[PDB]
Structure 1
Amino acid sequence: MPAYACQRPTPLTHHNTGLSEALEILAEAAGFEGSEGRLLTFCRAASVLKALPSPVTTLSQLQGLPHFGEHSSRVVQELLEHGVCEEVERVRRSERYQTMKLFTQIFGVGVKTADRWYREGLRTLDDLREQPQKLTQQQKAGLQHHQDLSTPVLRSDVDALQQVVEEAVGQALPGATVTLTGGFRRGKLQGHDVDFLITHPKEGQEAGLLPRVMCRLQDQGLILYHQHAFERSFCIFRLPQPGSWKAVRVDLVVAPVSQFPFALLGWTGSKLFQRELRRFSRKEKGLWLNSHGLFDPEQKTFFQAASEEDIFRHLGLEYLPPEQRNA
């Protein structure tokens, strides 16, 4: 079992679902208390279990597995013995956890905002609605649309949304392309948002594209919310439904064709996979990776990539298709 998640296939579905879910509760809880290191370890340990070829049935099967020490091993031990880990259940039940989860799930609210609101004694969505003078425009949108945004986005929704984005992109800039990214590209059947990456085969033609796309979607009556030389737009779309509609989070991202493979890689995820890939790149290969490129700080050069395959090769990693990047 390699130590970095980018060095091993991680399928969407696996053989240790219960165990990984328990560790991810602890990861999430650590994030709520500002401990990113503990979040990372619990996330990595969970991801290791996702990568195993069969279920863990005994404690001995953890021996030698990366990211399993005293704490994560105890969590697994208690689940194997009793079907439940008391620490995990204590977190699930805490007012702190439930409220921080509720608040941080609001679009426009991060851990810091949620925590300050928690400390001020606020607990419910109606508590926030009663004092809306404090809220940002983004948080107001997040709160108004919260119910719809909690409903899973389905594959049918994605196909509908892709068509309308293509229509607007085609008018904004003939020849421009739209690629589905994020969780749906990794094979997920549901999600909480749809991610698209837009480019054009002629380098430079994509300049100024996103405002033109946004203005056109706005005029078609499809934009319930957006933030406005920008390249990422976090929107709430109005998606047609039987006799009605629902609000759906959509991210639209633009990259020049030179950067497309890096942007595609970054935006396809998973979040943990990409953090691990960037960590690997820097620590093991001395190369700096982001969604724009891959930089050699010795030679002071950028690696030209024509594909995701190119990027894995330049990092000395076996290629993983998107459906094996579910770390």
Structure 2
Amino acid sequence: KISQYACQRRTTLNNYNQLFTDALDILAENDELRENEGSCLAFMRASSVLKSLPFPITSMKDTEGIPCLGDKVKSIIEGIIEDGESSEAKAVLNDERYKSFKLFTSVFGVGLKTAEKWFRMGFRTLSKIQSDKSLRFTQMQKAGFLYYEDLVSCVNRPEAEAVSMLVKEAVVTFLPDALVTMTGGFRRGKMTGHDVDFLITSPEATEDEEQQLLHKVTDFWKQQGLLLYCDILESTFEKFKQPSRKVDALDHFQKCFLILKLDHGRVHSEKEGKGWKAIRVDLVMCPYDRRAFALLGWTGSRQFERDLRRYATHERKMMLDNHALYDRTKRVFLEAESEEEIFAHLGLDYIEPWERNA
């Protein structure tokens, strides 16, 4: 019996149901754009459970015993079995609002509100937006347009590794005992990503040293001429606050959203223009004692994290977020030195990072 929770499923990158899940992901994305949160969640849970299957669906009978497959979802699956296409997902792909929202939000610094504003102004192409003489752009959007082609091309593993080397070299210069871990999609085994994420932590750094590291590292890159964009969010972390109750938990750790200049000579790949590539990089600094909670939250996937927190609350009366694990019955915070200890506290079989592609 396949669990309704992604945290009780093993979801690897050999997806045998991409025909179904690509269509369900499009429908979920459209529901997000149309502000239909409920329908979005239902399509995400259905897509997630099919991604966990070790075999492709080839008949409606193959869907028996699978949870999170409501009547609307089963009609979509039936239609794809019929002629290899989803008429519902095809209509979303041809919808003018959907096309414009995908295109506009593909720019770094453009979210749902700005994409909606530009659509209602009559804009449909990035060329018309960039060349407009009346529009005013945020600093984030200016960087998004300046480095657009590099940011929309996928970051691959040789590029992610080259960025890891840069991050580690900069960090150990100021904190030699620091631990730097690549998180997100690449930690889950993905071949590509839209960015490269890292978790930094130091066992001996002070509260002030911990606060200053991201400022020191980004000033070092700024001096080197490698910092193309930088936004540092100061920590709002509270050592003794209960973890978040929210469906989508916020991360309160100090972090930075960057664009780095990655010189082609630093990339050891099988394969050239300007000789460098703009790469989105996120750095997160956390206190040493919370490193396993942060690693778990930043490794993802988003669906795996949502179900982990939902399982903790509904099944174990525990409160989990990126900073801590609190037991409401025992009235104690639970400590962990690894992700394995967090899973053990939750009464879950350990799911490897490459098995969290829910």
Same-fold status (TM-score > 0.5): yes
1:240 to 256, 263, 288: 263
Aligned residue runs from structure 1 range 174-323, under 5 A? 174-202=176-204, 204=206, 206-227=210-231, 229-230=234-235, 231-241=254-264, 242=272, 244-323=275-354
Whether the aligned pair in 2 keeps the contact of 1:309 and 1:319 (CA below 8 Å) is yes
The match for 2:50 is: 49
Whether the aligned pair in 2 keeps the contact of 1:181 and 1:268 (CA below 8 Å) is yes
Structure 1 residues 133 and 82, CA gap change in structure 2 (3 angstroms): closer
Cα shift readout 1:164-214 (whole Å, capped 9, x = no counterpart)? 111110112121121111100000111111011111122645343211121
SS in 2 for 1:284: helix
SS in 2 for 1:232: strand
Whether the aligned pair in 1 keeps the contact of 2:15 and 2:52 (CA below 8 Å) is yes
Aligned residue runs from structure 1 range 109-188, under 5 A? 109-129=110-130, 130-131=132-133, 133-188=135-190
Alignment identity in percent? 46
Deviation (angstroms), 1:131: 4.3
Whether the aligned pair in 1 keeps the contact of 2:175 and 2:205 (CA below 8 Å) is no
> Following the alignment from structure 1 to structure 2, what is the Cα–Cα distance between the partners of residues 307 and 234?
26
> Following the alignment from structure 2 to structure 1, what is the Cα–Cα distance between the partners of residues 110 and 328?
36
SS in 1 for 2:289: coil
The match for 2:10 is: 9
Taking structure 1 as the reference length, the TM-score comes to 0.96
Deviation (angstroms), 1:112: 2.3
Deviation (angstroms), 1:132: 6.6
> Following the alignment from structure 1 to structure 2, what is the Cα–Cα distance between the partners of residues 170 and 306?
22
The match for 2:268 is: none
Asked if 1:27 corresponds to 2:50, the answer is no
> Following the alignment from structure 2 to structure 1, what is the Cα–Cα distance between the partners of residues 330 and 220?
43
SS in 2 for 1:259: helix
**One-letter amino acid of the counterpart of residue 327, structure 2:** D
The match for 2:40 is: 39
Where do 5+ consecutive residues of structure 2 fail to align? 236-253, 265-271
Taking structure 2 as the reference length, the TM-score comes to 0.88
Q: Report how many aligned residue pairs link the two structures.
A: 327
> Following the alignment from structure 2 to structure 1, what is the Cα–Cα distance between the partners of residues 120 and 306?
31
Asked if 1:96 corresponds to 2:97, the answer is yes
Deviation (angstroms), 1:84: 1.1
> Following the alignment from structure 1 to structure 2, what is the Cα–Cα distance between the partners of residues 296 and 115?
42
> Following the alignment from structure 1 to structure 2, what is the Cα–Cα distance between the partners of residues 285 and 119?
46
The match for 1:325 is: 356
> Following the alignment from structure 2 to structure 1, what is the Cα–Cα distance between the partners of residues 119 and 158?
37
> Following the alignment from structure 1 to structure 2, what is the Cα–Cα distance between the partners of residues 7 and 303?
21
Whether the aligned pair in 2 keeps the contact of 1:203 and 1:258 (CA below 8 Å) is no
> Following the alignment from structure 1 to structure 2, what is the Cα–Cα distance between the partners of residues 260 and 203?
14
Cα shift readout 1:265-323 (whole Å, capped 9, x = no counterpart)? 11111011111111211222222111111123455432111100011111111100100
> Following the alignment from structure 1 to structure 2, what is the Cα–Cα distance between the partners of residues 44 and 155?
28
> Following the alignment from structure 1 to structure 2, what is the Cα–Cα distance between the partners of residues 67 and 146?
37
SS in 1 for 2:197: strand
> Following the alignment from structure 1 to structure 2, what is the Cα–Cα distance between the partners of residues 189 and 139?
27
**One-letter amino acid of the counterpart of residue 234, structure 1:** F
> Following the alignment from structure 2 to structure 1, what is the Cα–Cα distance between the partners of residues 346 and 121?
47
Worse overlay, 230-239 or 119-128: 119-128
Cα shift readout 1:208-266 (whole Å, capped 9, x = no counterpart)? 32111211121121110012544110101111125611111001111111110011111
Whether the aligned pair in 2 keeps the contact of 1:172 and 1:216 (CA below 8 Å) is no
Whether the aligned pair in 1 keeps the contact of 2:19 and 2:84 (CA below 8 Å) is no
SS in 1 for 2:65: coil
SS in 1 for 2:257: strand
SS in 2 for 1:317: coil
Deviation (angstroms), 1:55: 1.0
Deviation (angstroms), 1:133: 4.5
